[PDB]
Amino acid sequence: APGLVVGLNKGKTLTKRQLPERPSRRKGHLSKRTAFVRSIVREVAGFAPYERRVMELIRNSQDKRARKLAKKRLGTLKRAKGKIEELTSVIQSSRLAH
């Protein structure tokens, strides 16, 4: 018969189950087209005045200067570390060509 016994206890016998991944958890995954679009835009748009300062600092060594500048403008060190790696790759790609 349809009806819920809303009291306590159903059985202490337990066995775990394996769940898949929900599609929301896939957020933050990088798409092939999105990475292409970002690379196109990064080239088409120039660099910020602070980004040009960091790039010219990185070229003439001065890594501590670049990290300190990036942290001061961006904020946390995690953002600063990501910008240095991004701008270093921009320099290397440019230096391979011009």
């Binding site: 999105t34 679009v37 970002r38 835009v41 990064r42 088409v44 748009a45 120039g46 660099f47 910020a48």
Partner: protein, 166 residues
């Protein structure tokens, strides 16, 4: 699609292209009136993602507010008063300089038959949406009054509830 390029380009808010355009357009926008109609959105990606459709009954208005309450919320209420026959849908930042912050508001005509016959924007025609910007029911208004979900975000406590059998 070309809106993925526009959305990605809008993140480089002061690159060489974006800084030059913001400087040029700020000079032009200061020549025109404080509140003036925009023939088309300057950010067709941002307006599109905020509910705007390029069809009749959708109106774009630009406004500048002095810097130095929320600026976006002030832009919405002043534009909504300016064209009082329209319903303020949303708003977005387009530009700023040392003196002014420029915003564009998306307004919807609730009397146009292209709006009243679209079930996706039919809701705005109902009178409960009269001057949403004045009651804090827009996106910036909801954010301004701490409306949200979580632990991050009185009358029933100041009362003394006295039951019949107590």
């Amino acid at each position: 699609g070309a809106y993925k390029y526009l959305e990605e380009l809008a993140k480089k808010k002061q690159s060489d292209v974006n800084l030059f355009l913001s400087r040029v357009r700020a000079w032009e926008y200061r020549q025109m009136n404080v509140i003036h109609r925009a023939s088309r959105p300057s950010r067709p990606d941002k307006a599109r993602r905020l509910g705007y459709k390029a069809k009749q009954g959708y109106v774009i208005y630009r406004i500048r507010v002095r810097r130095g309450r929320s600026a976006r919320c002030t832009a919405e209420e002043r534009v909504g008063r300016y064209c009082s026959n329209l319903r303020v849908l949303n708003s977005y930042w387009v530009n700023q300089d040392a003196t002014y912050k420029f915003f564009e508001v998306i307004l919807v005509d609730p009397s146009h038959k292209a709006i009243r016959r679209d079930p996706r924007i039919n809701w705005i025609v109902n009178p409960v949406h009269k001057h949403r910007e004045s009651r804090g029911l827009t996106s910036i208004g909801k954010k301004s009054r701490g409306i949200g979900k979580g632990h991050r975000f009185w009358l029933r406590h100041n009362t003394l509830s006295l039951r019949r059998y107590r």
